Amino acid sequence: KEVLSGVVFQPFEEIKGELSLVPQTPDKSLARQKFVDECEAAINEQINVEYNASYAYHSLFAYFDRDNVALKGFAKFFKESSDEEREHAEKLMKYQNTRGGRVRLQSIVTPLTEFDHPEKGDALYAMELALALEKLVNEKLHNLHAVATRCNDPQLTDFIESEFLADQVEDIKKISEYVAQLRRVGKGHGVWHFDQKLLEEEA
Template sequence: MLSEYIYIYIYIYILAKFFKESSEEEREHAEKLIKYQNIRGGKVVLHPIKNVPSEFDHEEKGDALYAMELALSLEKLTNEKLLNVHSVAGRNNDPQLADFIESEFLAEQVESIKKISEYVAQLRRIGKGHGTWHFNQSLLHEGNTA
């Protein structure tokens, strides 16, 4: 849920299409986990989220690179937490939970990390300014040429 909030703020600020899609994807993931928890007879407790950043200015890196680096760190954190859940499932002999985490999340997380890592590398190469505008335009048109 934290990543969904942060992606929404980034979406409002810069790189609209990419972060809007990322926010929607994270919401879908949260809904899958909630549904799975309910199916297994668990109880879902949502806690308030504090200290969500709403400014993504960075004098040295520029807004786009800073935002994309934040997204990459969130994806890595999410992957780490999913791996922890998978490990707990293994230690507790719960192959159904392990399979759910593997089939629904892990491969997609690796792909997201790879894609965002590539974006970070591109943004580091192009620097701030007009190149960032071109990068944003390429994201807007990504997938439209299929």
């Protein structure tokens, strides 16, 4: 035996006490190890957060794709963001199953559909909405991370940091920069031009 900063290390002897950690009933995960209910439930929450964000971005896409709005760069940007939030949800679903939890998909609420806001202009308002949405997803990611830290699940904390937190802060800066640019160019010709550059970036 070895005790290292209070942590007991039992030496390697045999694989048999762990054979009891091989479940013998077919409805139970065999992979699950040190993956507690709180972390399972917090992953399920973040799946519903990302999916709802995907749906919200699809609603934004549907508005700017209107012929009388005609901001194709915005529409494509919001469509791709919807695809991305859904990929996040899917990656979290795969992770849940990798750790042996159960994915529990919840309801998705009606999102906002109209983004007609003449004072700021539709484009600036919607990009600010997108920024707020990303910050909301980031808050939930931080909640998820706090659960994982409290449960001493270091594989989960690293998963969240490496797979989601870094992309999240990069998405927020990018959209923040879009808001700043839209404020600088102003409504009308400036917005249209920004939209054309968005369309070119989106290839």
